[PDB]
PDB file of C-alpha atoms and ligand atoms in Angstrom:
ATOM      1  CA  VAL A   1       0.000   0.000   0.000  1.00 24.73           C
ATOM      2  CA  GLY A   2       1.315   3.489  -0.766  1.00 27.35           C
ATOM      3  CA  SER A   3       1.134   6.821   1.042  1.00 24.59           C
ATOM      4  CA  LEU A   4      -1.364   7.930   3.754  1.00 24.89           C
ATOM      5  CA  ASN A   5      -2.925  11.375   3.191  1.00 25.90           C
ATOM      6  CA  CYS A   6      -5.699  13.624   4.457  1.00 28.65           C
ATOM      7  CA  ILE A   7      -7.496  16.001   2.118  1.00 29.73           C
ATOM      8  CA  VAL A   8      -9.728  18.885   3.371  1.00 24.75           C
ATOM      9  CA  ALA A   9     -11.054  22.339   2.445  1.00 25.41           C
ATOM     10  CA  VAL A  10     -11.218  24.637   5.483  1.00 28.05           C
ATOM     11  CA  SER A  11     -12.332  28.230   6.099  1.00 27.95           C
ATOM     12  CA  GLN A  12     -10.310  30.816   7.943  1.00 24.12           C
ATOM     13  CA  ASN A  13     -12.156  30.019  11.151  1.00 24.16           C
ATOM     14  CA  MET A  14     -11.235  26.307  10.673  1.00 27.28           C
ATOM     15  CA  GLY A  15     -14.710  25.298   9.515  1.00 26.54           C
ATOM     16  CA  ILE A  16     -15.208  22.222   7.393  1.00 27.07           C
ATOM     17  CA  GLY A  17     -18.982  21.644   7.537  1.00 28.17           C
ATOM     18  CA  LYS A  18     -22.362  23.059   8.561  1.00 28.39           C
ATOM     19  CA  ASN A  19     -25.510  20.990   8.884  1.00 28.21           C
ATOM     20  CA  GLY A  20     -23.843  18.080   6.872  1.00 27.35           C
ATOM     21  CA  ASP A  21     -22.930  20.290   3.941  1.00 26.81           C
ATOM     22  CA  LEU A  22     -20.147  22.646   3.071  1.00 25.84           C
ATOM     23  CA  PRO A  23     -20.052  26.036   4.896  1.00 26.49           C
ATOM     24  CA  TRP A  24     -19.492  27.824   1.542  1.00 26.33           C
ATOM     25  CA  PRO A  25     -21.305  27.736  -1.800  1.00 25.88           C
ATOM     26  CA  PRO A  26     -20.198  24.988  -4.146  1.00 23.67           C
ATOM     27  CA  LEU A  27     -16.731  25.625  -5.693  1.00 27.10           C
ATOM     28  CA  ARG A  28     -16.708  23.581  -8.832  1.00 27.72           C
ATOM     29  CA  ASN A  29     -12.972  23.665  -9.551  1.00 26.00           C
ATOM     30  CA  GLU A  30     -12.168  23.016  -5.888  1.00 27.21           C
ATOM     31  CA  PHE A  31     -14.282  19.866  -6.089  1.00 29.20           C
ATOM     32  CA  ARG A  32     -12.544  18.883  -9.337  1.00 28.72           C
ATOM     33  CA  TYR A  33      -9.173  19.201  -7.463  1.00 22.75           C
ATOM     34  CA  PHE A  34     -10.484  16.906  -4.728  1.00 25.52           C
ATOM     35  CA  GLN A  35     -11.637  14.338  -7.317  1.00 25.12           C
ATOM     36  CA  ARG A  36      -8.374  14.474  -9.193  1.00 23.59           C
ATOM     37  CA  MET A  37      -6.085  14.160  -6.204  1.00 21.82           C
ATOM     38  CA  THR A  38      -7.998  11.343  -4.564  1.00 22.03           C
ATOM     39  CA  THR A  39      -8.567   9.356  -7.826  1.00 22.40           C
ATOM     40  CA  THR A  40      -5.157   9.580  -9.492  1.00 24.90           C
ATOM     41  CA  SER A  41      -3.132   6.516  -8.598  1.00 26.77           C
ATOM     42  CA  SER A  42       0.545   6.482  -8.871  1.00 23.47           C
ATOM     43  CA  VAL A  43       0.681   2.619  -9.596  1.00 23.77           C
ATOM     44  CA  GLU A  44      -0.553   0.481 -12.540  1.00 21.84           C
ATOM     45  CA  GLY A  45      -3.411  -1.879 -11.731  1.00 23.13           C
ATOM     46  CA  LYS A  46      -4.276  -0.251  -8.386  1.00 21.98           C
ATOM     47  CA  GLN A  47      -6.899   2.234  -7.158  1.00 21.18           C
ATOM     48  CA  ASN A  48      -6.708   4.637  -4.312  1.00 22.08           C
ATOM     49  CA  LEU A  49      -8.750   3.987  -1.092  1.00 22.35           C
ATOM     50  CA  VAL A  50     -10.880   6.724   0.507  1.00 21.76           C
ATOM     51  CA  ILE A  51     -11.589   6.394   4.167  1.00 21.36           C
ATOM     52  CA  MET A  52     -14.404   8.486   5.717  1.00 20.22           C
ATOM     53  CA  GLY A  53     -16.668   8.561   8.774  1.00 20.08           C
ATOM     54  CA  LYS A  54     -20.280   7.680   8.543  1.00 20.65           C
ATOM     55  CA  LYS A  55     -21.612  11.280   8.521  1.00 20.80           C
ATOM     56  CA  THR A  56     -19.182  12.176   5.730  1.00 22.69           C
ATOM     57  CA  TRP A  57     -20.383   9.232   3.644  1.00 23.26           C
ATOM     58  CA  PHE A  58     -23.992  10.302   3.997  1.00 24.12           C
ATOM     59  CA  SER A  59     -23.094  13.900   3.149  1.00 26.76           C
ATOM     60  CA  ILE A  60     -22.131  12.810  -0.356  1.00 26.99           C
ATOM     61  CA  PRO A  61     -25.291  13.117  -2.583  1.00 23.94           C
ATOM     62  CA  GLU A  62     -26.778   9.630  -2.845  1.00 25.42           C
ATOM     63  CA  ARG A  63     -26.090   9.594  -6.515  1.00 21.67           C
ATOM     64  CA  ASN A  64     -22.413  10.580  -6.287  1.00 21.40           C
ATOM     65  CA  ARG A  65     -21.661   7.820  -3.903  1.00 23.89           C
ATOM     66  CA  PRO A  66     -19.531   5.786  -3.954  1.00 23.68           C
ATOM     67  CA  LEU A  67     -16.794   8.116  -5.050  1.00 21.36           C
ATOM     68  CA  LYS A  68     -16.105   6.642  -8.472  1.00 21.48           C
ATOM     69  CA  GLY A  69     -12.816   5.000  -9.359  1.00 17.18           C
ATOM     70  CA  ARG A  70     -11.769   4.696  -5.724  1.00 17.12           C
ATOM     71  CA  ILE A  71     -12.387   2.040  -3.144  1.00 19.13           C
ATOM     72  CA  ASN A  72     -14.727   3.499  -0.525  1.00 15.80           C
ATOM     73  CA  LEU A  73     -14.377   2.535   3.116  1.00 15.82           C
ATOM     74  CA  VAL A  74     -16.658   3.847   5.870  1.00 17.57           C
ATOM     75  CA  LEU A  75     -15.843   3.989   9.587  1.00 18.26           C
ATOM     76  CA  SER A  76     -18.603   3.203  12.055  1.00 18.96           C
ATOM     77  CA  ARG A  77     -19.139   1.184  15.253  1.00 19.51           C
ATOM     78  CA  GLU A  78     -22.950   1.290  14.842  1.00 21.61           C
ATOM     79  CA  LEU A  79     -23.297   0.001  11.333  1.00 20.63           C
ATOM     80  CA  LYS A  80     -23.119  -3.750  10.911  1.00 21.63           C
ATOM     81  CA  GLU A  81     -22.376  -3.747   7.149  1.00 22.29           C
ATOM     82  CA  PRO A  82     -21.151  -1.194   4.570  1.00 23.32           C
ATOM     83  CA  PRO A  83     -23.846   1.325   3.560  1.00 24.26           C
ATOM     84  CA  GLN A  84     -25.598   1.035   0.268  1.00 23.71           C
ATOM     85  CA  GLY A  85     -22.952   1.723  -2.433  1.00 25.28           C
ATOM     86  CA  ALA A  86     -19.917   1.518  -0.082  1.00 22.01           C
ATOM     87  CA  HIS A  87     -17.307  -1.214  -0.338  1.00 20.05           C
ATOM     88  CA  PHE A  88     -15.852  -1.666   3.071  1.00 19.32           C
ATOM     89  CA  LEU A  89     -16.678  -0.969   6.774  1.00 16.67           C
ATOM     90  CA  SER A  90     -14.248  -0.726   9.675  1.00 15.07           C
ATOM     91  CA  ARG A  91     -14.760   0.026  13.360  1.00 11.69           C
ATOM     92  CA  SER A  92     -11.626   2.181  13.738  1.00 12.72           C
ATOM     93  CA  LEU A  93      -8.990   3.891  11.672  1.00 17.77           C
ATOM     94  CA  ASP A  94      -6.370   1.394  12.957  1.00 17.89           C
ATOM     95  CA  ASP A  95      -8.611  -1.387  11.783  1.00 20.20           C
ATOM     96  CA  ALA A  96      -9.055   0.149   8.316  1.00 21.38           C
ATOM     97  CA  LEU A  97      -5.356   0.584   7.900  1.00 22.67           C
ATOM     98  CA  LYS A  98      -4.756  -3.075   9.082  1.00 22.73           C
ATOM     99  CA  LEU A  99      -7.357  -4.135   6.502  1.00 22.53           C
ATOM    100  CA  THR A 100      -5.372  -2.613   3.612  1.00 22.36           C
ATOM    101  CA  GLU A 101      -2.714  -5.272   4.421  1.00 24.56           C
ATOM    102  CA  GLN A 102      -5.189  -8.201   4.167  1.00 23.07           C
ATOM    103  CA  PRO A 103      -5.032 -10.527   1.100  1.00 22.07           C
ATOM    104  CA  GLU A 104      -8.330  -8.976  -0.006  1.00 23.16           C
ATOM    105  CA  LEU A 105      -6.745  -5.389  -0.456  1.00 22.42           C
ATOM    106  CA  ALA A 106      -2.951  -5.560  -0.171  1.00 22.95           C
ATOM    107  CA  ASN A 107      -2.360  -5.598  -3.888  1.00 19.11           C
ATOM    108  CA  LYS A 108      -5.322  -3.463  -4.918  1.00 20.62           C
ATOM    109  CA  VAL A 109      -4.742  -0.241  -2.925  1.00 17.80           C
ATOM    110  CA  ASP A 110      -2.182   2.508  -3.924  1.00 19.31           C
ATOM    111  CA  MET A 111      -2.700   5.739  -1.898  1.00 19.51           C
ATOM    112  CA  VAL A 112      -4.960   5.997   1.191  1.00 16.26           C
ATOM    113  CA  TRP A 113      -6.976   9.321   1.398  1.00 17.64           C
ATOM    114  CA  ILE A 114      -8.837  10.273   4.576  1.00 19.09           C
ATOM    115  CA  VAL A 115     -11.623  12.511   3.393  1.00 15.82           C
ATOM    116  CA  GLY A 116     -13.381  13.402   6.675  1.00 13.21           C
ATOM    117  CA  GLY A 117     -14.745  14.162   9.194  1.00 14.10           C
ATOM    118  CA  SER A 118     -13.263  15.899  12.159  1.00 13.00           C
ATOM    119  CA  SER A 119     -12.554  12.933  14.421  1.00 13.44           C
ATOM    120  CA  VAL A 120     -11.095  10.829  11.602  1.00 14.07           C
ATOM    121  CA  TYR A 121      -8.739  13.760  10.672  1.00 15.43           C
ATOM    122  CA  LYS A 122      -7.770  14.185  14.296  1.00 14.60           C
ATOM    123  CA  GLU A 123      -6.802  10.607  14.798  1.00 17.10           C
ATOM    124  CA  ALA A 124      -4.896  10.345  11.543  1.00 14.64           C
ATOM    125  CA  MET A 125      -3.046  13.614  12.311  1.00 12.63           C
ATOM    126  CA  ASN A 126      -1.891  12.487  15.758  1.00 12.84           C
ATOM    127  CA  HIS A 127      -0.854   8.952  14.806  1.00 18.25           C
ATOM    128  CA  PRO A 128       2.851   8.350  14.323  1.00 16.14           C
ATOM    129  CA  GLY A 129       4.305   7.880  10.884  1.00 15.85           C
ATOM    130  CA  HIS A 130       4.597   9.491   7.457  1.00 13.25           C
ATOM    131  CA  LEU A 131       1.503  11.514   6.621  1.00 12.69           C
ATOM    132  CA  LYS A 132       0.623  14.385   4.231  1.00 15.55           C
ATOM    133  CA  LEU A 133      -2.238  16.911   4.531  1.00 17.17           C
ATOM    134  CA  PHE A 134      -3.659  18.434   1.380  1.00 19.12           C
ATOM    135  CA  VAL A 135      -5.350  21.555   2.714  1.00 15.29           C
ATOM    136  CA  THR A 136      -7.414  24.018   0.667  1.00 19.59           C
ATOM    137  CA  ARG A 137      -7.443  27.343   2.573  1.00 19.44           C
ATOM    138  CA  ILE A 138     -10.787  29.069   1.913  1.00 20.10           C
ATOM    139  CA  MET A 139      -9.678  32.645   2.816  1.00 25.03           C
ATOM    140  CA  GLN A 140     -12.969  33.909   4.317  1.00 26.52           C
ATOM    141  CA  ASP A 141     -14.875  33.076   7.521  1.00 25.93           C
ATOM    142  CA  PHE A 142     -17.902  30.887   7.175  1.00 27.13           C
ATOM    143  CA  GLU A 143     -20.389  29.794   9.846  1.00 27.92           C
ATOM    144  CA  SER A 144     -19.616  26.186  10.621  1.00 28.44           C
ATOM    145  CA  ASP A 145     -20.574  23.507  13.079  1.00 29.75           C
ATOM    146  CA  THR A 146     -17.657  21.098  12.480  1.00 31.61           C
ATOM    147  CA  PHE A 147     -13.980  22.102  12.431  1.00 32.03           C
ATOM    148  CA  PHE A 148     -10.577  20.881  11.269  1.00 33.80           C
ATOM    149  CA  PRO A 149      -8.228  19.859  14.068  1.00 36.95           C
ATOM    150  CA  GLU A 150      -5.201  21.988  14.905  1.00 38.26           C
ATOM    151  CA  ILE A 151      -2.276  21.457  12.557  1.00 42.01           C
ATOM    152  CA  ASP A 152       0.912  21.286  14.738  1.00 40.53           C
ATOM    153  CA  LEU A 153       3.445  23.059  12.574  1.00 40.46           C
ATOM    154  CA  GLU A 154       6.314  21.805  14.763  1.00 42.01           C
ATOM    155  CA  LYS A 155       5.677  18.443  13.002  1.00 42.09           C
ATOM    156  CA  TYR A 156       3.774  19.339   9.768  1.00 44.11           C
ATOM    157  CA  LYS A 157       6.002  21.071   7.280  1.00 44.93           C
ATOM    158  CA  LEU A 158       4.318  23.315   4.677  1.00 43.11           C
ATOM    159  CA  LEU A 159       5.922  22.195   1.425  1.00 43.74           C
ATOM    160  CA  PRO A 160       7.191  25.007  -0.894  1.00 44.18           C
ATOM    161  CA  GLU A 161       5.420  23.399  -3.908  1.00 43.97           C
ATOM    162  CA  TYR A 162       4.136  20.072  -4.989  1.00 45.14           C
ATOM    163  CA  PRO A 163       3.597  18.503  -8.467  1.00 45.40           C
ATOM    164  CA  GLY A 164       0.066  18.804  -9.657  1.00 45.45           C
ATOM    165  CA  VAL A 165      -0.894  21.444  -7.097  1.00 41.77           C
ATOM    166  CA  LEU A 166      -1.279  25.001  -8.250  1.00 42.37           C
ATOM    167  CA  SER A 167       0.573  27.468  -5.982  1.00 46.76           C
ATOM    168  CA  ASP A 168      -1.274  30.706  -6.738  1.00 45.33           C
ATOM    169  CA  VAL A 169      -4.527  32.121  -5.445  1.00 47.27           C
ATOM    170  CA  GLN A 170      -7.716  30.671  -6.963  1.00 48.72           C
ATOM    171  CA  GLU A 171     -11.178  32.281  -6.954  1.00 50.43           C
ATOM    172  CA  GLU A 172     -14.649  30.945  -7.616  1.00 49.47           C
ATOM    173  CA  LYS A 173     -18.013  32.625  -6.727  1.00 53.72           C
ATOM    174  CA  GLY A 174     -16.105  35.589  -5.388  1.00 54.92           C
ATOM    175  CA  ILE A 175     -14.307  33.291  -2.851  1.00 55.06           C
ATOM    176  CA  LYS A 176     -10.464  33.282  -2.911  1.00 54.86           C
ATOM    177  CA  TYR A 177      -8.721  30.084  -1.863  1.00 54.79           C
ATOM    178  CA  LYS A 178      -5.321  28.419  -2.162  1.00 59.49           C
ATOM    179  CA  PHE A 179      -3.889  24.922  -2.111  1.00 60.36           C
ATOM    180  CA  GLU A 180      -1.261  23.747   0.440  1.00 58.61           C
ATOM    181  CA  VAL A 181       0.494  20.491   1.166  1.00 54.73           C
ATOM    182  CA  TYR A 182       1.934  19.607   4.576  1.00 54.93           C
ATOM    183  CA  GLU A 183       4.095  16.678   5.458  1.00 54.44           C
ATOM    184  CA  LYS A 184       5.128  15.089   8.778  1.00 56.26           C
ATOM    185  CA  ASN A 185       7.201  11.986   9.475  1.00 57.58           C
ATOM    186  CA  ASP A 186       7.395  10.926  13.140  1.00 57.39           C
TER     187      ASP A 186
HETATM  188  N1  NDP B   1     -13.220  19.129   3.315  1.00 61.52           N
HETATM  189  C1  NDP B   1     -14.284  19.439   3.909  1.00 61.52           C
HETATM  190  O1  NDP B   1     -14.659  20.755   4.047  1.00 61.52           O
HETATM  191  C2  NDP B   1     -15.011  18.221   4.501  1.00 61.52           C
HETATM  192  C3  NDP B   1     -16.214  18.499   5.097  1.00 61.52           C
HETATM  193  N2  NDP B   1     -16.927  17.416   5.701  1.00 61.52           N
HETATM  194  C4  NDP B   1     -18.208  17.819   6.333  1.00 61.52           C
HETATM  195  O2  NDP B   1     -17.937  17.475   7.788  1.00 61.52           O
HETATM  196  C5  NDP B   1     -19.239  16.954   8.349  1.00 61.52           C
HETATM  197  C6  NDP B   1     -19.247  15.439   8.730  1.00 61.52           C
HETATM  198  O3  NDP B   1     -18.274  15.316   9.668  1.00 61.52           O
HETATM  199  P1  NDP B   1     -18.284  14.940  11.146  1.00 61.52           P
HETATM  200  O4  NDP B   1     -19.578  15.614  11.742  1.00 61.52           O
HETATM  201  O5  NDP B   1     -16.963  15.173  11.765  1.00 61.52           O
HETATM  202  O6  NDP B   1     -18.348  13.267  11.000  1.00 61.52           O
HETATM  203  P2  NDP B   1     -17.692  11.885  10.490  1.00 61.52           P
HETATM  204  O7  NDP B   1     -17.809  11.774   9.076  1.00 61.52           O
HETATM  205  O8  NDP B   1     -16.378  11.666  10.957  1.00 61.52           O
HETATM  206  O9  NDP B   1     -18.734  10.882  11.077  1.00 61.52           O
HETATM  207  C7  NDP B   1     -18.830  10.583  12.522  1.00 61.52           C
HETATM  208  C8  NDP B   1     -19.505   9.230  12.640  1.00 61.52           C
HETATM  209  O10 NDP B   1     -18.565   8.275  11.866  1.00 61.52           O
HETATM  210  C9  NDP B   1     -18.189   7.219  12.608  1.00 61.52           C
HETATM  211  N3  NDP B   1     -16.733   7.413  13.011  1.00 61.52           N
HETATM  212  C10 NDP B   1     -15.983   8.561  12.859  1.00 61.52           C
HETATM  213  N4  NDP B   1     -14.723   8.210  13.268  1.00 61.52           N
HETATM  214  C11 NDP B   1     -14.611   6.878  13.514  1.00 61.52           C
HETATM  215  C12 NDP B   1     -13.609   5.954  13.914  1.00 61.52           C
HETATM  216  N5  NDP B   1     -12.280   6.216  14.128  1.00 61.52           N
HETATM  217  N6  NDP B   1     -14.014   4.666  14.107  1.00 61.52           N
HETATM  218  C13 NDP B   1     -15.273   4.246  13.916  1.00 61.52           C
HETATM  219  N7  NDP B   1     -16.218   5.053  13.568  1.00 61.52           N
HETATM  220  C14 NDP B   1     -15.923   6.383  13.386  1.00 61.52           C
HETATM  221  C15 NDP B   1     -18.975   7.341  13.957  1.00 61.52           C
HETATM  222  O11 NDP B   1     -20.098   6.634  13.726  1.00 61.52           O
HETATM  223  P3  NDP B   1     -20.854   5.648  14.609  1.00 61.52           P
HETATM  224  O12 NDP B   1     -21.616   6.429  15.644  1.00 61.52           O
HETATM  225  O13 NDP B   1     -21.790   4.960  13.656  1.00 61.52           O
HETATM  226  O14 NDP B   1     -19.930   4.654  15.270  1.00 61.52           O
HETATM  227  C16 NDP B   1     -19.342   8.826  14.118  1.00 61.52           C
HETATM  228  O15 NDP B   1     -20.558   9.160  14.870  1.00 61.52           O
HETATM  229  C17 NDP B   1     -20.286  17.288   7.316  1.00 61.52           C
HETATM  230  O16 NDP B   1     -20.553  18.686   7.508  1.00 61.52           O
HETATM  231  C18 NDP B   1     -19.579  17.223   5.945  1.00 61.52           C
HETATM  232  O17 NDP B   1     -20.096  18.215   4.972  1.00 61.52           O
HETATM  233  C19 NDP B   1     -16.574  15.986   5.754  1.00 61.52           C
HETATM  234  C20 NDP B   1     -15.323  15.816   5.106  1.00 61.52           C
HETATM  235  C21 NDP B   1     -14.528  16.874   4.509  1.00 61.52           C
HETATM  236  C1  D2B B   2     -19.958  17.478   0.597  1.00 58.83           C
HETATM  237  O1  D2B B   2     -18.597  17.038   0.148  1.00 58.83           O
HETATM  238  C2  D2B B   2     -18.458  16.251  -0.989  1.00 58.83           C
HETATM  239  C3  D2B B   2     -19.369  16.346  -2.070  1.00 58.83           C
HETATM  240  C4  D2B B   2     -19.204  15.541  -3.201  1.00 58.83           C
HETATM  241  C5  D2B B   2     -18.146  14.626  -3.287  1.00 58.83           C
HETATM  242  C6  D2B B   2     -17.221  14.558  -2.241  1.00 58.83           C
HETATM  243  C7  D2B B   2     -17.345  15.393  -1.123  1.00 58.83           C
HETATM  244  C8  D2B B   2     -16.474  15.236  -0.044  1.00 58.83           C
HETATM  245  C9  D2B B   2     -15.397  16.052   0.389  1.00 58.83           C
HETATM  246  C10 D2B B   2     -14.876  17.157  -0.332  1.00 58.83           C
HETATM  247  C11 D2B B   2     -15.516  17.930  -1.239  1.00 58.83           C
HETATM  248  O2  D2B B   2     -14.665  18.996  -1.678  1.00 58.83           O
HETATM  249  C12 D2B B   2     -13.484  18.747  -1.031  1.00 58.83           C
HETATM  250  N1  D2B B   2     -12.427  19.534  -1.160  1.00 58.83           N
HETATM  251  C13 D2B B   2     -11.294  19.133  -0.483  1.00 58.83           C
HETATM  252  N2  D2B B   2     -10.181  19.825  -0.727  1.00 58.83           N
HETATM  253  N3  D2B B   2     -11.248  18.119   0.374  1.00 58.83           N
HETATM  254  C14 D2B B   2     -12.401  17.439   0.619  1.00 58.83           C
HETATM  255  N4  D2B B   2     -12.267  16.432   1.500  1.00 58.83           N
HETATM  256  C15 D2B B   2     -13.593  17.732  -0.101  1.00 58.83           C
HETATM  257  C16 D2B B   2     -16.966  13.960   0.706  1.00 58.83           C
HETATM  258  C17 D2B B   2     -15.837  13.136   1.188  1.00 58.83           C
HETATM  259  C18 D2B B   2     -18.153  14.187   1.705  1.00 58.83           C
END
């Protein structure tokens, strides 16, 4: 299995969701960036794996789901089987990561992308090892009810550029935003 990554879009006040939807109006090119980064596999014959909590899964429009061209894994202790359209279910992040090593997935999975929500990001971010964060900074405040965890910059380097990631300021619907990549290894 290849790299472990988180990907998020976050307002200036650290918001990532409101009422199960985005705090901001839809940003079409931002979403296209998310689809491209999560889908594009570095390795022939493999797909990337997306890991998400249960509320994140159900926030994807019921069409739309599963995220196409990726293996979709949902985290829940309540559910007894994967949701309609999902491929895998695990009780914990540690369990999902252990699962990628099973005969069933070990040769199928390239990159692992954690795509939300809060608690899943927090645990990934605080777990030892080599991890990257792909963070879209939405440069306005937006009312939110779910937030991105603190990024400890002692450990997460901001990289000075990254292939495939534009470095300049983007704007859609009057909303400026920019792409960043962080990397820790501990
Ligand atoms: N980039 C962005 O701006 C993103 C925004 N979002 C948004 O964030 C919100 C959803 O996020 P949030 O409210 O944090 O919820 P989560 O998606 O993380 O869902 C929480 C539920 O998932 C299950 N769960 C989460 N973590 C684990 C774990 N380690 N092990 C087992 N089960 C786990 C639990 O379910 P159970 O009770 O069944 O055990 C929990 O009640 C929505 O607003 C959505 O729009 C989501 C992703 C990215
Ligand atoms: C309601 O959000 C979605 C709607 C349709 C398809 C996927 C998403 C998700 C997340 C991101 C969307 O833009 C995104 N942008 C970035 N930089 N990271 C993210 N994690 C998302 C899922 C996982 C809930």
